[PDB]
Write a protein that binds this ligand. Structure first.
Ligand SMILES: Nc1ncnc2c1ncn2[C@@H]1O[C@H](COP(=O)(O)OP(=O)(O)O)[C@@H](O)[C@H]1O
Ligand SMILES: Nc1ncnc2c1ncn2[C@@H]1O[C@H](COP(=O)(O)OP(=O)(O)O)[C@@H](O)[C@H]1O
Ligand SMILES: [Cl-]
Ligand SMILES: [Zn+2]
Ligand SMILES: [Zn+2]
Lengths: 69, 69
């Protein structure tokens, strides 16, 4: 079933690319209608970057959660 | 830049999962507004399946080509 191909790719995408800043924790994310937004950083590193005033790694990639648009 | 993360993931997704039927040729695809549709089969296997009357592997997965929806 094609929705499972999409789902399994998303599970994999989320798993193999950890937080861009600390490289170990997995990334923060949220569900955004029919998209999954994967933020570049875990929450700890995100809150940290506000504290240290660095916005270099701020960002996200949205992913349609279904096989068919 | 976040659009490049999306693009590089798509280049990889397309590269490591070949046609579901013959497992060697890369898949057919088309550009569909702001989505990239990756069909489950290469064209040769798709046209073949119509000939042999098998629709088991028919299908596709659409991918938003941008980082931000
Ligand atoms: N964990 C995180 N890592 C990196 N960037 C983040 C993180 N959380 C939020 N951001 C960034 O902060 C901004 C606000 O995000 P968000 O709340 O998703 O926007 P919206 O207001 O459209 O819902 C965006 O630039 C987002 O990329
Ligand atoms: N190379 C292929 N491999 C597998 N399935 C395919 C292939 N080409 C077309 N199909 C299937 O045939 C049907 C028609 O596809 P398409 O032309 O993308 O639909 P639309 O008419 O919405 O543009 C869909 O079920 C699609 O998945
Ligand atoms: Cl996508
Ligand atoms: Zn982190
Ligand atoms: Zn094939």
């Amino acid at each position: 079933d094609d929705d499972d191909k999409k789902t399994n790719w998303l599970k994999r995408i989320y798993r193999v690319r950890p937080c861009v800043k600390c490289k170990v924790a997995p990334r923060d994310w949220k569900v955004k209608n029919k998209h999954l937004r994967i933020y570049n950083m875990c929450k700890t590193c995100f809150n940290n970057s506000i504290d240290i005033g660095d916005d270099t790694y701020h960002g996200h990639v949205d992913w349609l959660m279904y096989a068919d648009s």
